[PDB]
């Protein structure tokens, strides 16, 4: 029970008993924090609490010191202390936004601006106390009983009374009883587990808690510059095809951390396996949040890096299927790729962290933690789509926001940026530069001119609250049979309700704009659904049209974004 401050770093045996995290706080702080606070709980070796018997002043204010015990002023002797006075909580050893953090549900937009606009403590603080708030409310969700199995992917379901019933889609991974993890997507709802067992009524689904393991290294190291390379040793014949990344693997050997802005298709996975054959002696491990941007790098890595020294990290509770080329768990490898919440205690001579708009300041610590290495380049995009925070419902999170990382690559600018965008029709690419990139992003491709917008606001439904747009749906439809070239094009679009709809409508497959991410496809259907504040969000937009590498068809309802779409506008 004896710690170090998490405002100031003076040693303390104070905690505040109130915080959801505990956290030290010395005399001074636990004091600017017990006086501005509904907080008045203070521990150390034994609980601020009043020790006559049967008594409940648990509040620090009222408390005092009689020898060596508390107690309020209603059981104190007359030789007693204040605990609380001139501006100190009685401790051994002897703000605003801390309080903040400490006290807020995390349900607004401002909450998760302080989290990352606060000191280095404070940003892990923060992380352990949402991630922690983000958990104990995947409980307050009614537990998911069977009741009826139809065939080998559809079922009807029993839910618990008075306990709300949580959003059906592949975003929420359920825990089936432990007959292995599942996820639904809506009477005929959709059921598919990670794990092949015969549907039982009667078994049922409660979401994974998982808990919240304190946070000790900073989301982003102090940062070093150098004046030359260190601890990397470079080649002098990198292949012409990594020649345009050169000046910028040398700023990697001479900084300790790196960012690089990457918008759609302008080389990030190519910088990154690139930079394995720049220094190519050095270990470096190649970690992400999900197992699909591990995966991406992976098959990067597949290409040109040997095989031999390259290994796949599988956790043993093996959700759902990933990389299976690589030699698995040989964490020993010069080429380890491994997604975050699985990474071993292990070092590197890089640590290369990609698809950096996804992750959280949770993550950006625990890989702090987990890899001690001589240089870490973290790779992404603050214009592409963050990771969902489930609590937040007032308000909109900026890029700014999203991140350490995010935060930096906003304010001061990232470090290294890939100006040329070689995925995407001119229309894509010069739509996408003048809305998210400030006119920075050029396109390599010519207009493909398959790039068409169309302003139909349909009819929204709503499955709960996934919305749907049959009009939308049924425009494709009309589009599909006079351009049966779009027959192998994916269909994308803000909600799993109108890509249900649209799978079975059209027959094409769907994909959510989140779920896009990362892929890229010769065809896109895009149906905007709704306007919505989630539909407009310029992020999702951007995500979602530079999928195409060919050609995009835009079925749009906010007239903005339609404007602002720079495609061949179509008539029905
Ligand atoms: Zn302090
Ligand atoms: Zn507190
Ligand atoms: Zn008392």
């Known amino acids: 029970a004896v710690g170090a401050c998490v405002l100031c770093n003076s040693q303390t045996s104070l905690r505040c008993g109130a915080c959801i995290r505990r956290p030290f706080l010395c005399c001074k702080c636990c004091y600017d924090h017990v006086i501005s606070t509904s907080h008045k709980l203070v521990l150390s070796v034994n609980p601020y609490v009043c020790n006559a018997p049967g008594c409940d002043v648990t509040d620090v204010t009222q408390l005092y010191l009689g020898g060596m015990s508390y107690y309020c002023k209603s059981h104190k002797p007359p030789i007693s202390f204040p605990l609380c006075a001139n501006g100190q909580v009685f401790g051994l050893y ?18 998760y601006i302080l989290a990352n606009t606060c000191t280095e403590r404070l940003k892990l603080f923060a992380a352990e106390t949402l991630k922690a708030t983000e958990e104990t ?22 839910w618990e009374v008075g306990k709300p019933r949580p959003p059906l889609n592949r975003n929420y991974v359920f825990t089936g009883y432990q007959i292995g993890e599942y996820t639904f997507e809506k009477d005929a709802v959709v059921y598919r587990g990670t794990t092949t067992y015969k549907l039982n009524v009667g078994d049922y689904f409660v979401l994974t808690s998982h808990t919240v393991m ?32 050169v000046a910028n693997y040398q700023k990697v050997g001479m900084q300790k951390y790196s960012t690089l802005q990457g918008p759609p298709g302008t080389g990030k996975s190519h910088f990154a396996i690139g930079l394995a054959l720049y220094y190519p002696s050095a270990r470096i491990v190649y970690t992400a949040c999900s197992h699909a941007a591990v995966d991406a790098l992976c098959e990067k890595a597949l290409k040109y890096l040997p095989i031999d020294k390259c290994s796949r990290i599988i956790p043993a509770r093996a ?40 992750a959280t300041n949770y993550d950006l610590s625990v890989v702090n933690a987990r890899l001690r290495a001589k240089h870490y380049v973290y790779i992404g995009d603050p214009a592409q789509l963050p990771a969902p925070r489930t609590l937040l419902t007032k308000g909109t999170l900026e890029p700014e926001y999203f991140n350490s990382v995010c935060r930096l690559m906003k304010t001061i600018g990232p470090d290294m940026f890939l100006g040329t965008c070689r995925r995407c029709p001119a229309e894509i690419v010069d739509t996408v530069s003048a809305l998210v990139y400030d006119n920075k992003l050029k396109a390599h491709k010519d207009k493909s001119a398959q790039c068409f917008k169309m302003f139909y606001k349909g009819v929204i439904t709503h499955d709960v609250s996934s919305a749907i747009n049959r009009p939308q749906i049924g425009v494709v439809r009309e589009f599909l049979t006079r351009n049966p ?30 779920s896009s991410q990362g892929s890229e496809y010769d065809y896109v259907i895009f149906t905007q659904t709704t306007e919505t504040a989630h ?38």
Not at 96 to 106: K, L, S, V, Y
Request: with cysteine; hydrophobic share 40%; aromatic share 10%.
């Open 94 to 111: 002897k703000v605003t936004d801390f309080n903040a953090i400490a006290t807020c549900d995390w349900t607004n937009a401002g909450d």
């Open 137 to 158: 409310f995947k409980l307050s969700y009614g537990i998911a009983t069977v009741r009826e199995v139809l065939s080998d992917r559809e079922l009807h379901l029993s």
């Open 319 to 358: 959700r759902v299927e990933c990389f299976d080329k690589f030699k698995v768990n040989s964490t020993l490898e010069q080429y380890v790729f491994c997604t975050v919440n699985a990474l071993p205690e292990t070092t590197a001579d890089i640590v290369v962290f990609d698809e950096i708009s996804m």
């Open 214 to 245: 304190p946070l000790s290294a900073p989301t982003l190291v102090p940062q070093e510059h150098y004046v030359r390379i260190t601890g990397l040793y470079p080649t002098l014949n990198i292949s012409d095809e990594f020649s345009s990344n």
């Open 485 to 514: 070239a779009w027959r192998k094009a994916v269909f994308i679009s803000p909600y799993n309700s109108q890509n249900a709809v649209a799978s079975k409508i059209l027959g094409l497959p769907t994909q959510t704009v989140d």
């Open 535 to 572: 539909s407009c969000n310029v992020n999702r937009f951007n995500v979602a049209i530079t999928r195409a590498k060919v050609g995009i068809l835009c079925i749009m309802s906010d007239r903005d974004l339609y404007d602002k779409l720079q495609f061949t506008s179509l008539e029905i």
